[PDB]
Amino acid sequence: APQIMNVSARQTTSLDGQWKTIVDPFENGYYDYRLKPYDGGYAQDKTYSDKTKLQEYDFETDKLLFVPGDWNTQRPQLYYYEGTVWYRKHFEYSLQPGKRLFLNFGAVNYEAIVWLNGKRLGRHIGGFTPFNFEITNLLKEGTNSLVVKVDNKRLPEAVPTVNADWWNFGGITRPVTLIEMPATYIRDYYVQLAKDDKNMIEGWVQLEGSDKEQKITLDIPELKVKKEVTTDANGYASFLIKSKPILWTPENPKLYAVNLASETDKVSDEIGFRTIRTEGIKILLNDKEIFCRGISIHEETPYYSGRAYSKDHAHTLLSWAKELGCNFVRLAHYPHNEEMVREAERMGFLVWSEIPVYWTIHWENKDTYQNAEQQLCDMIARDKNRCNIIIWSIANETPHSKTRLTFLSNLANKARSLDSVRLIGAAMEKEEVQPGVLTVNDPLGELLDIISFNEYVGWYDGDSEKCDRVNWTFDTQKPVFISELGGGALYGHHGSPKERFTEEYQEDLYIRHVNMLKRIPGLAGTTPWILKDFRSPRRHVPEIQDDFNRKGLVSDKGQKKKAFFVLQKWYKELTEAYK
Amino acid sequence: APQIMNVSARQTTSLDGQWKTIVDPFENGYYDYRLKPYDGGYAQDKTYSDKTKLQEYDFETDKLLFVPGDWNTQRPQLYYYEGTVWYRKHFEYSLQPGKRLFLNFGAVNYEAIVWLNGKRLGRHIGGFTPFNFEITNLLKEGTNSLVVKVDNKRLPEAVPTVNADWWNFGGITRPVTLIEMPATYIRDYYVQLAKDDKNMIEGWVQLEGSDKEQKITLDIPELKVKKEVTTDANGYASFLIKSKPILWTPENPKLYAVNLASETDKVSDEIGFRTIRTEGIKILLNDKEIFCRGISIHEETPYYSGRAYSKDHAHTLLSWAKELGCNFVRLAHYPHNEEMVREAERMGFLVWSEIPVYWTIHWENKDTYQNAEQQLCDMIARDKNRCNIIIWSIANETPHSKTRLTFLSNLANKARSLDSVRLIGAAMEKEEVQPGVLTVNDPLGELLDIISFNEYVGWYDGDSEKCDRVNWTFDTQKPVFISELGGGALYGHHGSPKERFTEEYQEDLYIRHVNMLKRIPGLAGTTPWILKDFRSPRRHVPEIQDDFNRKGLVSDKGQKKKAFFVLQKWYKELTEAYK
Amino acid sequence: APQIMNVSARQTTSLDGQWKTIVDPFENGYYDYRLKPYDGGYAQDKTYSDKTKLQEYDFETDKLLFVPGDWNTQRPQLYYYEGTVWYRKHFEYSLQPGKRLFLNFGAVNYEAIVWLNGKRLGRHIGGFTPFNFEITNLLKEGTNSLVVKVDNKRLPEAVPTVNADWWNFGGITRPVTLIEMPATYIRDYYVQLAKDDKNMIEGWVQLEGSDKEQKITLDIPELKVKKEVTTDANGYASFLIKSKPILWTPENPKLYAVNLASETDKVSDEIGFRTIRTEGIKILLNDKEIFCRGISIHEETPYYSGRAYSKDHAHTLLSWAKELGCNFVRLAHYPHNEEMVREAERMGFLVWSEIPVYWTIHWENKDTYQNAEQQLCDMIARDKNRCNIIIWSIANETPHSKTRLTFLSNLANKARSLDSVRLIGAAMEKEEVQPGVLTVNDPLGELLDIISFNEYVGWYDGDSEKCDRVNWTFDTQKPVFISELGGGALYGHHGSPKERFTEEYQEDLYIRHVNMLKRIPGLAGTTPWILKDFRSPRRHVPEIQDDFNRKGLVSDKGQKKKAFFVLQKWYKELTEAYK
Ligand SMILES: O=C(O)[C@H]1O[C@H](O)[C@H](O)[C@@H](O)[C@@H]1O
Ligand SMILES: O=C(O)[C@H]1O[C@H](O)[C@H](O)[C@@H](O)[C@@H]1O
Ligand SMILES: O=C(O)[C@H]1O[C@H](O)[C@H](O)[C@@H](O)[C@@H]1O
Ligand SMILES: [Cl-]
Ligand SMILES: [Cl-]
Ligand SMILES: [Cl-]
């Protein structure tokens, strides 16, 4: 039922591959012609063997889809598809009596209803966060039937809502995993430095099962730490360990082998330690002023531009950002798969991690808030031990209103209640308060630790020359973070630096925009939009966009555009200046 | 803006062919990222010639679609597509000063918004009824730009609603026509027999313009009819002509040339005359008891199964119905294109004409009712002079409730207020009030002239044996009309007569069902479901259905299944019996 | 083995529908990796039930194709496909002992190899002619397996060769039929007027079976003919019957019910009678000088532009030619399906019937000649009783050489040896012997009864003005027949009459070309190219051609272009002038 920390380190079995599927736009498999649920629906996964009876479906002889994956890139007919697709898997598993078995979904966009052997396990909303079901006592001998009804229709009340600038990728987009656990298991745990304290590790551990009062030992061998505690009746224990670990940095992304062992379970992890705070306009990593030499990244694969999910995908994207000279990636606009965050952690990239509270969210809808806050809780719960994450982002480009401010205030408060260490950001927007004078006067800023905002001077707001004349001012002394900037270009399409969508315009733009950045007071980070061209249904210039947002510094085919090297050169200079 | 009678006989020019198009799932061409309408959207049809400015679209270099047509069968990517597609046409027209010009859409499913030269002409809802705009004063010299935003998203409040058993065919599905008119023109007229009177032609004529009081002459030369009247101050005149026309029958579908001439306009038509009434359980055409030897038909083309629109399409479908032995076709579940109705009239098929008040309509929604009634008015308005139509149908398979009954009673009253002659029906459903006793108890029946209903004994309700043993009773003495019956089969798929979806099962079903029909007291008509296999997203048996309803007596490739000849045999016997 | 006359009138059973298929571009199902045939190939149709053994295919779970049909329009992946596709059908048939069973293929393009129950029946080359196999003693109880290996790769030595201006439509393109016969049956027969003799019917009859010496009776009841003869030991009889039938004309396409009955078989037919000859520059139908008001037609369906095969397809196309005012159709460039020829015969269209000896045929290859002459024999054998055919065409636009002349001479001689009545044509080409002077000086002309040739003055040869100035002369006094002329236009695409591919240019072209035709000495027929836009892989103008030859007077969507009415008007004038 609840989230499981560090799924990859458990006894895991993959259900991935190719599953039988039924595309069901009118939801015939769920509703009868009176629009009422009915028992003989597709959840029952009845193979149509006896043709003397009538039924209107058969998984057994239908078409396959790859799992994990978006469905959109797998069939021309599903490119634009918004609606229901049924997924069906048969599997066997031999579970020794007394052991427990969980079914974990890395992500399904957007609504998933799950059945096992004809019985509903439950439902999930939110297309970028994991969820589990315990199947211990539902598992049968021999063949088991797993049915997933996946629907990605856009809903006004959803998070995100009916408008966004990326593709509506439906399906079982991340791996499906069977996790076996002992009868009482270590479900969740936290191990990080105390706030602003290079010399104190703090943490807690949470057991689940009938035997919740046990002795726990936290072992960090390289630190000669061997801390032993006893959980309470609720299965919980906290600890404080005087220690002086080598601190994680993008240059030296030191991780420690951490082993937790209770009487009935054991799990190993790789966890780094670092302090993060602001001081005036400075961001201080481990007490050292740093610049966030960043780049933004959508969860989309090189070359074929589907939903990313594997370590291969992550390593390819992050190696491009490595070459670009980054020490920071903004993972937009939703939690990415865990492989991406772990590979950023191993390679040395600080991370901004975000939930899709994006554009015109229904600020007055209480179910909508519940959804937003659950995604926030799940985002932090999964990755709270990833030291490379330093910013949680609660929103992106949301319009100003009283109800919106209340909504986002409650998320910021919840985030701080869950995590006292990391910084709280959100992509705000700029305003030209007087001709030639740009600022950010969003009341949300008072709730953030940084003045983080998107700006497109020279692309949406003027031609590139405007970068050469505008000036910036800010009314609070917090570090300034430009979470998006840039412009579009098609790789291989050349012309005058005045002609939009050529490589030469995007190059000229970045030269003048970089020079403008150098004069923005308090600037401490930049994550230009974006590393790689990505799919968007709002980009309709034929032979230029072709359903791609072209603001990548790398094409969707991994080709470095001229502008790539402008930013690379600046990042090489900032690397030396901040040594 | 108002409807125009007999468009095909006016001075017309076609705008059909291939138009430039933009698929726009998130409606970027209409709403900005704050979800607000914006100027600079795609309705302005700005060719992206000047690449020093930023634009996100270009009709001029985008892809084509055929007009008329559904979009679904034109590209694999559009097979399931529900959403917006923009259509764009450039055209020139030389309009003499003083003449008027109208833009007529035969049909656009579902919502159409139309601009000419960047100016919004208006908006239409309902995918099967025509609509017009006057463009007299908006036409420019040189190139004119016509832009249509077409959206087929399913809406709960729409007519039809979010569930139906046929394909959601979006696009400009029927021809687009420019109509030139004199400054004052004959917009509408009615010429038919008075109710139950073979010896009296009644009618009226309605002018539109500034010179509305004129002498009008009604000319039927074959009948030596020359009737002069003068319109009143509203452009309106009625008439009553004693005459004894040769009456239209299926066997002799006699049509007269009718010529209307006012002082400022002239239009010619082909119109037949017939009486129609019920008497007890009898249906009397021209005072002769008849049986409606019928077949149902969707508006879908032979072979490639797109939206039908041409006289070619109509002639092919109706020639199959001719071979089947029919004197009657039920055109379901919405107004068909006028070519279909005209070819039925010329070839000799009585017609049932229906609006898509189908399944779970939102009976409580006043906008839903106004939409339903507007489609009802438009259906009758276009075809009120087609004497082969004898039944208007206001509903199909709608759940019983008090509010549903008031909704449909208001439609029935409106239909009778518009047409005192034709019968009013609706597809009701049957009940098994006790084992082996079937009936129709629907209180809607009190408002209809016939006990019209769908029944699927032998397919959805029991195996074919059940036709052998059930009995039927009715609580009132109106003619009984079975508007649907039958079962599915794939042509070329053979096996035991017990095996569903084989030709042998469908054949055995029809043999036993026909014998059951012979004992239904008061049966006066049948329109089995259905002439031709058609597209439906609720039909998922792979290699058997493949997104087609397989209940056709003819395959979608024009092949007569075995059960075709069972109904043909019965119809030949009925033809002799009713001689 | 041999051809069967009048297949439709026999005891027939259709195997059409949807068959299992395997696309096999490298012919893995026929050749092993040493490029040698092997026994376990796909002809064996072994369902892959036992997965403890290895095989590389399974028809049972593979994809379907419609039969009859081209494969190209059925799947995007098969649009351009040239190569092998395997087709598989299971069927049962109960054959009473002593009866015979034949398997008839209307057409398969290009090479077909056929197996029944794992045994090779044989092979066929030629994509437009029928072929049969006797399966009497190969049929098994229960399920029978029919496998067809279809390959449409272009071969240099083939007929047609590697270049042609129409789509390479592969597959089982016409119906597949089981024909049951008595032990001795009437296989072939001929019944027509004697050459140039309105008062003498001549014919013959040919039996097949162990009982070949029988009494035969030819019955034409409406003529009060009841001719009885006795076949010889080879099963053959000839006859001459003094009679004066009403003669077939396009205006009154009179057909007689003809019944042939032997001791052991009987078959009915509908056969018309007419004389056809040339006299100087006149073509004389039934001794009356006629003009061939013609239009050319490819075997391609309205709307979706696949391979045509049904009576519906034929009626739609011929109704367009009816409206155009034609009394003649050129069926190019190969024998069309029998339905097309029979519907032309019923509706009143004279026919030119052709074999695909087209462009750069391998004149020196003796196998190539054998192929050409077999197609000629099969073309004449099927349709020798269709009085509406008056011209057999042996070639189209073939380059001049000694070997080509020998090749075509032998075909012309063979045609005359098979049919002494009909005219022999071939599409030759024009030459500009001096500026402004056009002629046809092809030595092939001496072997033809008409000076039949293609010309494209105003499209390929000059702009439309050239029609206004060139002059024509011919050195023999035979009737002149222009078998192709015209130009391309996209329906709905308008502009100046000077702009090619607009409707206005094609209209202006036809106005000036029609005027030129009126001054061509000896002109007796025209079949402009072409009735309907058709698929060609040599037409690459985007948004204009899009893989369609646009020389239709009707679009592929059945829309009459402006030029349609220019030719219609001329044909209406010729109808009056030749009364
Ligand atoms: O217009 C763009 O390119 C971008 O605008 C916004 O900044 C948004 O946050 C991005 O998601 C989007 O891609
Ligand atoms: O189930 C079916 O086939 C049919 O059921 C209903 O009777 C309905 O009116 C049809 O539109 C539908 O196709
Ligand atoms: O160029 C064309 O349009 C045509 O040229 C030749 O006349 C040929 O016979 C046609 O098959 C072809 O379509
Ligand atoms: Cl872009
Ligand atoms: Cl069905
Ligand atoms: Cl062309």
CSV table of N, CA, C and O in Angstrom, one decimal, chain A residues 355-412:
chain,number,residue,atom,x,y,z
A,355,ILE,N,7.1,19.1,-9.6
A,355,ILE,CA,5.8,18.5,-9.8
A,355,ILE,C,5.0,19.4,-10.8
A,355,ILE,O,5.2,20.6,-10.9
A,356,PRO,N,4.1,18.7,-11.6
A,356,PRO,CA,3.5,19.4,-12.7
A,356,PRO,C,2.3,20.4,-12.3
A,356,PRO,O,1.3,20.3,-13.0
A,357,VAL,N,2.5,21.2,-11.3
A,357,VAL,CA,1.6,22.3,-11.0
A,357,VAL,C,2.0,23.4,-12.0
A,357,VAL,O,2.8,24.3,-11.7
A,358,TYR,N,1.3,23.4,-13.2
A,358,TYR,CA,1.8,24.0,-14.4
A,358,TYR,C,0.7,24.7,-15.1
A,358,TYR,O,-0.4,24.2,-15.4
A,359,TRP,N,0.9,26.0,-15.3
A,359,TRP,CA,-0.1,26.9,-16.0
A,359,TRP,C,-1.4,26.9,-15.2
A,359,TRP,O,-1.4,27.2,-14.0
A,360,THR,N,-2.6,26.7,-15.8
A,360,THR,CA,-3.9,27.1,-15.3
A,360,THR,C,-4.5,26.0,-14.4
A,360,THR,O,-5.7,25.6,-14.7
A,361,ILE,N,-3.8,25.6,-13.4
A,361,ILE,CA,-4.4,24.6,-12.4
A,361,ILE,C,-5.6,25.2,-11.7
A,361,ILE,O,-5.7,26.4,-11.5
A,362,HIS,N,-6.6,24.3,-11.4
A,362,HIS,CA,-7.8,24.7,-10.8
A,362,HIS,C,-7.6,24.9,-9.3
A,362,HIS,O,-7.8,24.1,-8.4
A,363,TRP,N,-7.3,26.2,-9.0
A,363,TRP,CA,-6.8,26.6,-7.7
A,363,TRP,C,-7.9,26.4,-6.6
A,363,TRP,O,-7.6,26.2,-5.4
A,364,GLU,N,-9.1,26.5,-7.0
A,364,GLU,CA,-10.3,26.4,-6.1
A,364,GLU,C,-10.8,25.0,-5.9
A,364,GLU,O,-11.7,24.8,-5.0
A,365,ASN,N,-10.3,24.0,-6.6
A,365,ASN,CA,-10.8,22.7,-6.5
A,365,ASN,C,-10.0,21.9,-5.4
A,365,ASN,O,-8.7,21.9,-5.5
A,366,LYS,N,-10.7,21.4,-4.4
A,366,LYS,CA,-10.0,20.8,-3.3
A,366,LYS,C,-9.4,19.4,-3.6
A,366,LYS,O,-8.4,19.0,-3.1
A,367,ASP,N,-10.1,18.7,-4.5
A,367,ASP,CA,-9.5,17.5,-5.0
A,367,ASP,C,-8.2,17.7,-5.8
A,367,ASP,O,-7.3,17.0,-5.7
A,368,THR,N,-8.2,18.8,-6.6
A,368,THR,CA,-7.0,19.2,-7.3
A,368,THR,C,-5.9,19.5,-6.3
A,368,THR,O,-4.7,19.1,-6.6
A,369,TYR,N,-6.1,20.2,-5.2
A,369,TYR,CA,-5.1,20.4,-4.2
A,369,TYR,C,-4.6,19.1,-3.6
A,369,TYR,O,-3.4,18.9,-3.5
A,370,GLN,N,-5.5,18.2,-3.2
A,370,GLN,CA,-5.2,16.9,-2.7
A,370,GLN,C,-4.2,16.2,-3.7
A,370,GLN,O,-3.2,15.6,-3.2
A,371,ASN,N,-4.6,16.2,-5.0
A,371,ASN,CA,-3.7,15.6,-6.0
A,371,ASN,C,-2.3,16.2,-6.0
A,371,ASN,O,-1.3,15.5,-5.9
A,372,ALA,N,-2.3,17.6,-6.1
A,372,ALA,CA,-1.0,18.3,-6.1
A,372,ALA,C,-0.1,17.9,-4.9
A,372,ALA,O,1.1,17.6,-5.0
A,373,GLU,N,-0.7,17.9,-3.7
A,373,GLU,CA,0.1,17.7,-2.5
A,373,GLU,C,0.5,16.2,-2.4
A,373,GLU,O,1.6,16.0,-1.8
A,374,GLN,N,-0.3,15.3,-2.9
A,374,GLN,CA,0.1,13.9,-2.9
A,374,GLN,C,1.3,13.7,-3.8
A,374,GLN,O,2.2,12.9,-3.4
A,375,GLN,N,1.3,14.3,-4.9
A,375,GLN,CA,2.5,14.2,-5.8
A,375,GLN,C,3.7,14.8,-5.2
A,375,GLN,O,4.8,14.3,-5.3
A,376,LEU,N,3.5,15.9,-4.4
A,376,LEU,CA,4.6,16.5,-3.7
A,376,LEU,C,5.2,15.6,-2.6
A,376,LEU,O,6.4,15.4,-2.5
A,377,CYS,N,4.3,15.0,-1.9
A,377,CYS,CA,4.7,14.0,-0.8
A,377,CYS,C,5.4,12.8,-1.4
A,377,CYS,O,6.5,12.4,-1.0
A,378,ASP,N,4.9,12.3,-2.5
A,378,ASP,CA,5.5,11.1,-3.2
A,378,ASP,C,6.8,11.5,-3.8
A,378,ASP,O,7.8,10.7,-3.7
A,379,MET,N,6.9,12.7,-4.4
A,379,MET,CA,8.2,13.1,-5.0
A,379,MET,C,9.3,13.1,-3.9
A,379,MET,O,10.4,12.6,-4.1
A,380,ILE,N,9.0,13.8,-2.8
A,380,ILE,CA,10.0,13.9,-1.7
A,380,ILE,C,10.3,12.6,-1.0
A,380,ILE,O,11.4,12.3,-0.7
A,381,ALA,N,9.2,11.7,-0.9
A,381,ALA,CA,9.4,10.5,-0.2
A,381,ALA,C,10.4,9.6,-0.9
A,381,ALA,O,11.2,8.9,-0.3
A,382,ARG,N,10.3,9.5,-2.2
A,382,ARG,CA,11.2,8.6,-3.0
A,382,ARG,C,12.6,9.0,-2.9
A,382,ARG,O,13.5,8.2,-2.8
A,383,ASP,N,12.9,10.3,-3.0
A,383,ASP,CA,14.3,10.8,-3.3
A,383,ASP,C,14.8,11.6,-2.2
A,383,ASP,O,15.8,12.4,-2.3
A,384,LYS,N,14.3,11.6,-1.0
A,384,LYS,CA,14.8,12.4,0.2
A,384,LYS,C,16.2,12.0,0.6
A,384,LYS,O,16.8,12.8,1.3
A,385,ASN,N,16.7,10.9,0.1
A,385,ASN,CA,18.1,10.5,0.4
A,385,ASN,C,19.1,10.8,-0.7
A,385,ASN,O,20.2,10.3,-0.6
A,386,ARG,N,18.7,11.5,-1.7
A,386,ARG,CA,19.5,11.9,-2.9
A,386,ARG,C,20.1,13.3,-2.6
A,386,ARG,O,19.4,14.3,-2.8
A,387,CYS,N,21.3,13.3,-2.1
A,387,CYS,CA,21.9,14.6,-1.7
A,387,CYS,C,22.1,15.5,-2.9
A,387,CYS,O,22.2,16.8,-2.7
A,388,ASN,N,22.1,15.0,-4.1
A,388,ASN,CA,22.3,15.9,-5.3
A,388,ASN,C,21.1,16.8,-5.5
A,388,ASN,O,21.3,17.9,-6.2
A,389,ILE,N,19.9,16.4,-5.1
A,389,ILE,CA,18.7,17.3,-5.2
A,389,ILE,C,18.9,18.4,-4.1
A,389,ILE,O,19.0,18.1,-2.9
A,390,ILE,N,18.8,19.6,-4.6
A,390,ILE,CA,18.9,20.8,-3.6
A,390,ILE,C,17.7,21.7,-3.7
A,390,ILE,O,17.6,22.6,-2.9
A,391,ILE,N,16.9,21.6,-4.8
A,391,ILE,CA,15.7,22.4,-5.0
A,391,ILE,C,14.5,21.6,-5.3
A,391,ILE,O,14.6,20.7,-6.2
A,392,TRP,N,13.4,21.7,-4.5
A,392,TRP,CA,12.1,21.2,-4.8
A,392,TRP,C,11.3,22.3,-5.4
A,392,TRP,O,11.2,23.4,-4.8
A,393,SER,N,10.8,22.1,-6.6
A,393,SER,CA,10.0,23.1,-7.3
A,393,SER,C,8.5,22.7,-7.2
A,393,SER,O,8.1,21.6,-7.6
A,394,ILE,N,7.7,23.7,-6.8
A,394,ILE,CA,6.2,23.4,-6.6
A,394,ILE,C,5.3,24.0,-7.7
A,394,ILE,O,4.1,23.7,-7.6
A,395,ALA,N,5.9,24.7,-8.6
A,395,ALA,CA,5.0,25.3,-9.7
A,395,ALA,C,5.9,25.8,-10.8
A,395,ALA,O,7.1,26.0,-10.7
A,396,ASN,N,5.2,26.0,-12.0
A,396,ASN,CA,5.8,26.6,-13.2
A,396,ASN,C,4.8,27.4,-13.9
A,396,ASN,O,3.8,26.9,-14.4
A,397,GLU,N,5.1,28.7,-14.0
A,397,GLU,CA,4.4,29.7,-14.8
A,397,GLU,C,2.9,29.7,-14.5
A,397,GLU,O,2.1,29.5,-15.5
A,398,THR,N,2.5,29.8,-13.3
A,398,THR,CA,1.1,29.9,-12.9
A,398,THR,C,0.6,31.3,-12.7
A,398,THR,O,1.3,32.1,-12.1
A,399,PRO,N,-0.6,31.6,-13.2
A,399,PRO,CA,-1.1,33.0,-13.2
A,399,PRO,C,-1.4,33.4,-11.8
A,399,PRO,O,-1.8,32.7,-10.9
A,400,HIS,N,-1.3,34.8,-11.6
A,400,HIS,CA,-1.4,35.4,-10.3
A,400,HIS,C,-2.9,35.5,-9.9
A,400,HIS,O,-3.7,36.0,-10.7
A,401,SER,N,-3.2,35.0,-8.7
A,401,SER,CA,-4.5,35.2,-8.2
A,401,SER,C,-4.4,34.9,-6.7
A,401,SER,O,-3.5,34.2,-6.3
A,402,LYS,N,-5.4,35.4,-5.9
A,402,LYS,CA,-5.4,35.1,-4.5
A,402,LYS,C,-5.4,33.6,-4.2
A,402,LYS,O,-4.7,33.0,-3.4
A,403,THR,N,-6.3,32.9,-4.9
A,403,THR,CA,-6.5,31.4,-4.7
A,403,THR,C,-5.2,30.7,-5.1
A,403,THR,O,-4.8,29.7,-4.4
A,404,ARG,N,-4.6,31.1,-6.2
A,404,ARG,CA,-3.3,30.4,-6.6
A,404,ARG,C,-2.3,30.6,-5.5
A,404,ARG,O,-1.6,29.7,-5.2
A,405,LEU,N,-2.2,31.8,-4.9
A,405,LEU,CA,-1.2,32.1,-3.9
A,405,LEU,C,-1.4,31.2,-2.7
A,405,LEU,O,-0.5,30.6,-2.1
A,406,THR,N,-2.7,31.1,-2.3
A,406,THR,CA,-3.0,30.2,-1.1
A,406,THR,C,-2.6,28.7,-1.4
A,406,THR,O,-1.9,28.1,-0.6
A,407,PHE,N,-3.1,28.2,-2.6
A,407,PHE,CA,-2.7,26.9,-3.1
A,407,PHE,C,-1.2,26.7,-3.0
A,407,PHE,O,-0.7,25.7,-2.4
A,408,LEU,N,-0.4,27.5,-3.6
A,408,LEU,CA,1.1,27.3,-3.6
A,408,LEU,C,1.7,27.5,-2.2
A,408,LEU,O,2.7,26.9,-1.9
A,409,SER,N,1.1,28.4,-1.4
A,409,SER,CA,1.6,28.6,-0.1
A,409,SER,C,1.5,27.3,0.7
A,409,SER,O,2.4,26.9,1.4
A,410,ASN,N,0.3,26.6,0.6
A,410,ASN,CA,0.2,25.3,1.3
A,410,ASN,C,1.1,24.3,0.8
A,410,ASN,O,1.6,23.4,1.6
A,411,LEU,N,1.5,24.2,-0.5
A,411,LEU,CA,2.5,23.3,-0.9
A,411,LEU,C,3.8,23.6,-0.4
A,411,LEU,O,4.6,22.7,0.1
A,412,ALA,N,4.2,24.9,-0.4
A,412,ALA,CA,5.5,25.2,0.2
A,412,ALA,C,5.6,24.9,1.6
A,412,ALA,O,6.7,24.4,2.1
